[PDB]
Design a protein around this ligand. Structure first.
Ligand code: NA
Lengths: 252, 251
């Protein structure tokens, strides 16, 4: 089994402008993500960016970088262009890892690739078990449920499975965990064009969940519990200071 | 196409006791459902009951009765007993119609049987579009969403699909309908036993939705919008009088 990791780097942010290049212990944020991907055993790692500053910084650590169009609308159109420009074969496993995750556990990057290779779905993703009321009823925490083979039945901002008996109480009891989707995906490279070209579903627009396109078109997404729950993506100066502390402590 | 209709008619009811034998225009409620099933083109209609009062009454209008277990059974459990007891062949289509729907449109009984015959799936069912907030956010109203071919993705007591933008608002806006599942099923007779003997999912117990067992084992359930939206069933005395006046309005 071999797989390639593609990491989109988004330069623009009102809270952390130039985020991919934020210095963390002497390396830009994007380099840390790159290096987590290498530690996962990826045969190849590719930063996708539309900003020349990112290109230059990645070249300066010897990283592979693919320049993509500034006019893309979704991170799937972006991934599609990398697959085309870098000539990635249709059967090759690609893992999409967000460029704002410098502390992503390498084991889960490998996990999602391994899961895709082992199953009959063209796409694989992961979830974390949740049981705190905060996230269980939080529409920003996307819930997912699976069949006996691990294929997703549905993803939703609604609280799925609804516990009829325990959620009626008004003092809503949580007696078993739910599964919260995490934003890491593995695809057969050729499937990315299939996904891209499929007629958009109404479901995906109502829920604001792109992956519902796949379900609506009758195709499968494998889902597994992540081996280790990943830290949240870095969005603010406060989040960045937390990562700087963790990274500094990794040298102590 | 040929199908059999099985109509469960439990006498005991907390909301309306002895309901299958509640009078409507001179006939017990059960007789009205039976007559609607006959109008649908059913090869055969079977009333499934565990009470001999229902048995006597159905035989008195000339209906076929199958006696089922007087112990607590689930929906599938009851239906599987009839299928097993009368040795219904595995490839025969069985439509399960509730004994408390005296005004069920014969056309939708035929629809669910037709839909099942038109595909390879072991199971078919129906839904109605809903927009009323009291139904949309009610866990007693089971929601369903389908793929592009009409196969169920999930059934839930949660409000699905969640409209991110519109349901965040203090007064939630319903800008497209949802689908409410209605309790009419068609199955391949043999599938019913498989369904019965399958390893149970956790999902089915949490949501209290038996049909999630099927989705968990990865088998398909086809779902279509009812060709005619059924009238309300009968759960309470109030509901009964609604039917009584509908029938009275005809004469
Ligand atoms: Na340390």
């Amino acid at each position: 089994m071999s797989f390639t990791v593609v990491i989109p780097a988004r330069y623009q942010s009102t809270r952390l402008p130039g985020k991919p290049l934020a210095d963390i212990g002497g390396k830009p944020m994007i380099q840390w993500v790159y290096e987590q991907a290498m530690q996962a055993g990826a045969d190849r790692v590719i930063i996708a960016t539309d900003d020349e500053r990112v290109e230059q910084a990645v070249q300066a650590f010897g990283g592979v970088v693919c320049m993509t169009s500034p006019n893309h609308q979704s991170g799937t159109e972006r991934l599609a262009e990398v697959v085309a420009k870098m000539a990635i074969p249709a059967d090759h496993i690609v893992v999409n890892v967000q460029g704002d995750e410098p502390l992503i556990p390498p084991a889960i990057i490998r996990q999602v690739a391994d899961n895709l290779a082992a199953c009959s779905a063209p796409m694989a993703t992961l979830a974390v078990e949740i049981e705190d009321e905060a996230e269980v009823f939080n529409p920003n925490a996307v819930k997912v449920i699976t069949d006996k083979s691990g294929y997703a039945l549905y993803f939703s901002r609604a609280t799925i499975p609804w516990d009829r008996d325990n959620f009626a109480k008004a003092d809503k009891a949580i007696v078993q965990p739910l599964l919260r989707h995490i934003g890491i995906y593995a695809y057969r490279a050729g499937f990315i064009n299939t996904y891209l070209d499929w007629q958009p579903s109404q479901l995906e627009k109502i829920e604001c969940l792109e992956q519902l396109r796949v379900l609506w078109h009758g195709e499968k997404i494998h889902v597994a519990v992540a081996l280790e729950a990943p830290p949240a993506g870095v969005d603010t100066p406060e989040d960045l200071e937390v990562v700087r502390r963790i990274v500094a402590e990794r040298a102590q």
